[PDB]
């Protein structure tokens, strides 16, 4: 959907001779592509929905202990074997004990003793497992054309104008090709399967929050939990401890509620919102492969608008080096084509920075239409000319930042995507592949030995590991294992510090 | 055992964030803290075996690791 | 009180010449003292006692939050500065939210969002300490004289019988002496301040649980704390979650609880009783002396006895090295002593196993009545004979153990003690000299170091650093130093065994 | 009692000066006490016999499943937890199986299968627990006299002439003093307690068959055992199968009975007699020191006899190396003392060799009495002379053998007790002398370290390490572990080959 | 953080005696067992930089321990 | 697991006397008998395995008897 207000905002270029791009469009961003001459198009993915989830394990977080019953035999005899065992629900642990005269046994040693208690959970942490096949990607796709900035951002108007359409898209419905009015139709063959990796992670309900936790983590508690619609629970002796071996009544205590335990426990879980058998979530990547081929410039360009324009909002910056301004046509002249262009001088009127808006147009036929333009100044002092003649509207601009420093600054966030995405990011933005396919199967080969190596490591052990790796390799001997271990523990500082820890 | 970073792609923080630097070394520090008396005798078998003197660093610091956080 | 059906029991033998003897009289071990002359006396310390205590902390585990309000700002206008941060009982944090003109603001970038929330703590883990004054043991003393199996327990007919009595020891009352119907009275002059250390222990109060915990370790504790009878909550951050920074709104949560955190928080804690501002703890120690001057025997002007004795119950071991016999007397001789002895053979008929009850004697002038008799035999077989003549009645008795085992049972048991008690180990069962002295003066100067540098150290680690300290040592070329060096190993390989874990 | 036609008979002969001996008392193996001028007695142990005994583990060998029920869970579901599962004696296992389409599953693979079966045990072999005061020998004393070789072997005969008595020796009444008509009283100081260790034998009971078998060996076994009134049965899945795991159904067979496999185990178990909760078994032995002090002499005050003596029945050997005769009496004059010798020619008429039964005579005054001696001739010819002159009655005796065969063969026999005894055959016999007791000290000392070595392996395991220590041993360099191997091998095959195997 | 060991004389057991044994431990042989691939690395680098077999030794396992328990 | 001889001393017979020299034998001539391909490949390993005579017979040996009693 539209990009505004959006912390991460990727642009990538359009060749003219390519007709199809690969994105990863990875959740909580805005990938926005500027074409040559086809207009710019931005996807954003809304959310992941999911839908009949089955349990998997109930773990129990609080427990209930009360009815405790105690028997004890002599030293000589064996184990004492108390009645209540039998019945389930009952946790039963044997023991042992000091015996005499004065107990009433005829012989001293170390007698037996055994113990019930009956068992009960109050409320359990049930585990959830999303299938494959029910995970539906919310997918949105946007066209800049004649937008208000109110209406930048309503569906409702946007689908009526029929610029932005969102789509579902799912295993059954991996294609979908978007119908606009004019712009022509844009054809997404998403692979929504490979997206997210539902083997690999559970739904952990803890009371009313739900979670997102892994296969292994979830199966590896030290909890009593039982199966899926099964009474008897497995494991039970950890929310329940016997105080002190007593021949006359020995006390059983349960430990307090490990509710807090699984939050503390949950430090790396990305929580979901769970309602009416509905997963929600936002995180995730889809890698789609936008199809270009269809979609086309309006033919008919309108005359350029004679009347005043005022900015209804004056310029201002977006952050991702891209300025955001609306201007309000005072007259009504129908469908014209706004003159507005950015400038490195007054005395030279060919623009110098692109506009991501494509050829704004101000649709409405009223009065005081407002018109949302999106422009990329170039860095350094600019001038936003709006109209030109006697009614131009020049505005000074600044553009904090240089070229090496954006070059520095988006190779250290396609180094982060890298990191956060494995061998998927040698996806994104990739057009020929003729070079990104063997970068990508060498990702993947050095990937599947970094993961079988490393692993699930803190932050602060990969950064221990790493300036060890450095200190033995700055003094190794042969400069071929000094090289592999100074990348490798290059890499793992990078992934120690990508963490922001 | 803490869940730990997720295998996820999240732009957003994740249950606890702000923790996030504090979970694996608040204990260590608070353990040091009680009992600094170990300090001296970590770096001293470090120094008296390492036959270099960056593996008497790296044994110190290692065994002045491996103290607070048992096995 | 009895030493009978004891898990610990410790038999030490006064020097002759010698009026007094120290003993650390540990908590639930009894302890037996057998004089040259002087009847047998056991004392065991049953519990510890203290009254009026006074809360230092109050650590909550569950918090309730509610009237979450919170204010953001634009970007770059400064923080939003809530105003309910002054208003206390509200937990504020500043966050960091991308705010656009979909959001109502006017310019874009990273705005400053405050959040407050009421901050209610449900429950309060509650803290004491331990008056020094205030803290009174209670040590019970006894005297084996002859009683029923039946009644050799039972405190009612000892107290009538002024075999056995209760008294307490307090810092302003250090010696107590305890009359008797005939023995005559016993002295005990001990430190009771001395004994156990209450400048290093906390009573914790979890809910209904009660805990002695140490000092260091219940101040170190990461929970919401407050001074007593104050509501002001410092670092309360930690059990109150702000889930996501979003426009206008920032939901926050609370973790449900955390008993199960500080249950298992409490490894090694000592489970106490607590009730009406009454502690009741039975473990602990008490490091005593008592002076047995006073001390003497009974029954000893009456003669031998010329009836038949039969064995009512048969002789059974306790485990320490001692049989336990109820004799039975046929006849009605009056008040006698029975001439009851263990010798190695019925051929020779030499004394040669010492026996705890010294100089039995038949109490009461019934025809038919019972006592109770405790003797301590030689290794291998031995006859247990009682009288000579027609009228004796032997018995057989085969202890399984050894001269070399006893001696290594005994230093095993020896080396624990000093472990667990350290430097008061060194005065249980000494009656003075300089070898002790000395010994306990290097203990002191030794400990004092040992616990400096391993304070907190599990039996894990030090098991792991002994084991490296016995490898270093076995390659280390100086013979002092390799010898120092052996010598920490063991002391911390035998340390962390004698956890048993 | 008697011990005529007994094998492993050993004749021991007292010290002159001294007037006591300690014996072991073999299981079925008499040994008869022969003394200087004292009458010549021999006591024999009759059985060990038990009560009151205690079950340890009741094991199960006759498994019974019934009322098999399955659930099936499709894959990526859970586990199938079967609802009799709560239920006890209902033996449940969980499998894992091949799902499809055609089962009626969702998503095909591998999915979950448990089982229920109601397992019941139709046969138990219990067990049980010897309590070491329990245990009473029975022991009986025979002293040889006139006897009648028909009422020789008849119990009550003897009981009527007042020379054989039973007596049962009892931990609570060790030493116990036997009553004889004319002869004296007998009184022995065994020590029931150490003869048997009881405290490492089970009596286990299989059907209506009883053994005694080893602690170790009945802990041990893998069978369904459950603890003394216990209805909940432990570790079921030995004797239960399932064969084959299917969807629809799984079939559920017990295994047979595991009777036959206990008796194929049971290969030097020994069995018993039990009656009425009444152990009853004759092996076993009891150290012994036997009291001559009060035996006397009978018929000392009788004259010779008159008339002439006829053979009854012709001399037998025993193949103890003594000769058993009976003497028939022609004339009447009353109780008369029979003159009877071996004398090694008739030109000497000296007696050479010693008679088993001490001064024999005829106690009857009928006409026609019989009566049995037992001889003990020499090595070579023997004449056994009845009387003189004319009514002399003679017989020529051959006793085949030699001193140093004899010497060789009670080597070999003392060889043999040692081996079957340990320590205590240094007491057979033994006057308490210096030279036995370190005898026995280092046996002990040799002997611990020679069980715990070797505790329970196989004859033929014996013979082969045996083998090779003697290989290692002639091949060795150093002479003390030469001859330590040597030794050591020696030991080994000589036990290996003890039991005839 | 946990109690441990309380230093006071206590013959018998504390609030949790059971789990003596496996406090310490459970953790270090779940991550064990979670990711087996860490084995060898501690391996090769005790190998790399030990320059004694000892010494090899005592690196791989302070590496396994502090793997493990972070820090 | 067999019982074993009992340690207490017993002149009579155990319940099973007869087999007391089978037993422990049987089992194993049986294997042999129908397995005599074995015999070659143990007498060729305790060739190879020892270099002096008399320990290439006790490897041969060996070898056989392990054979037949597995583990
Ligand atoms: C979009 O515009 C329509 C018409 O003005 C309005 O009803 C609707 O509420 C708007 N959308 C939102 C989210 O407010
Ligand atoms: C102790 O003795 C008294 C009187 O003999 C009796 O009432 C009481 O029940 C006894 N208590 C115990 C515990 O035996
Ligand atoms: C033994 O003597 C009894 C007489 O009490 C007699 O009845 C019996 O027949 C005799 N023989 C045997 C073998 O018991």
């Not at chain 1, 898209?169 to 022509?184: L, R, V």
């Not at chain 1, 180094?415 to 994104?428: C, E, K, P, S, V």
């Amino acid at each position: 959907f539209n990009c505004l207000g959006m912390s991460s905002r990727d642009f990538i270029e359009g060749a003219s001779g390519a007709t199809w791009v690969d994105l990863v469009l990875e959740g909580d961003s805005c990938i926005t592509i500027m074409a040559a001459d086809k207009p710019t198009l931005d996807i954003r993915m809304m959310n992941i929905e999911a839908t009949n989830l089955a349990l998997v394990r109930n773990y129990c977080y609080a427990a209930t202990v009360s009815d405790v019953s105690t028997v004890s035999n002599c030293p000589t005899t064996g184990e004492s074997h108390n009645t209540k065992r039998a019945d389930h629900n009952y946790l039963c642990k044997r023991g042992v004990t000091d015996r005499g005269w004065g107990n009433g046994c005829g012989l001293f040693g170390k007698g037996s003793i055994d113990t019930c208690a009956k068992f009960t959970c109050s409320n359990s942490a049930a585990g959830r497992l999303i299938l494959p096949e029910d995970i539906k990607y919310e997918v949105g796709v946007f066209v800049h054309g004649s937008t208000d900035s109110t209406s930048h951002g309503n569906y409702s108007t946007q689908i009526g104008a029929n610029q932005a359409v969102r789509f579902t898209i799912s295993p059954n419905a991996p294609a979908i090709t978007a119908k606009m009015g004019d712009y022509g139709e844009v054809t997404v063959e998403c692979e929504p399967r490979s997206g997210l990796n539902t083997e690999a992670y559970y739904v952990m309900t803890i009371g009313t929050k739900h979670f997102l936790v892994h296969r292994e983590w979830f199966n590896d508690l030290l909890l009593p939990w039982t199966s899926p619609a099964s009474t008897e629970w497995r494991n039970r002796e950890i929310l329940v401890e016997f105080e002190e071996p007593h021949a006359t009544k020995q006390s059983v205590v349960a430990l307090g509620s490990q509710e807090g335990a699984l939050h503390q426990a949950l430090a790396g879980a990305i929580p979901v919102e769970f309602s009416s058998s509905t997963l929600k979530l936002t995180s995730g990547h889809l890698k789609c492969r936008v199809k270009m081929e269809k979609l086309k410039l309006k033919g008919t360009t309108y005359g350029m608008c004679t009347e005043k324009f005022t900015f209804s909002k004056n310029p201002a910056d977006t952050g991702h080096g891209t300025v955001v301004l609306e201007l309000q046509y005072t007259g009504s002249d129908g469908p014209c084509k706004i003159p507005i262009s950015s400038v490195a001088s007054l005395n030279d009127m060919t623009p110098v920075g692109r506009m991501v808006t494509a050829n704004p147009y101000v649709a409405s036929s009223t009065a005081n239409a407002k018109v949302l333009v999106e422009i990329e100044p170039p860095f350094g002092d600019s001038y936003i000319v709006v109209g030109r003649g006697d009614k131009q509207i020049n505005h000074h601009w600044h553009k904090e930042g240089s070229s090496i420093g954006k070059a520095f600054s988006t190779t250290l966030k396609g180094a982060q995507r890298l990191a956060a995405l494995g061998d998927t990011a040698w996806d994104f933005g990739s057009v020929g592949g003729v070079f990104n396919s063997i970068g990508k199967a060498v990702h993947q080969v050095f990937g599947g030995a970094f993961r079988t190596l490393f692993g699930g490591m803190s932050w602060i052990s990969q950064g221990l590991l790493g300036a060890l790796l450095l200190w033995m390799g700055v003094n190794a001997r042969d400069k071929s294992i000094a090289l592999a271990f100074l990348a490798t523990g290059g890499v793992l500082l990078f992934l120690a510090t990508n963490v922001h820890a | 055992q803490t869940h730990g970073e997720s295998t996820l792609v999240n732009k957003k923080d994740a249950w606890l964030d702000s923790t996030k630097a504090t979970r694996y070394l608040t204990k260590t520090e608070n353990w040091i803290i009680r009992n600094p008396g170990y300090a001296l005798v970590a770096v001293v078998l470090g120094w008296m075996l390492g036959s270099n003197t960056g593996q008497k660093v790296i044994f110190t610091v290692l065994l002045l690791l491996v103290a607070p956080a048992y096995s």
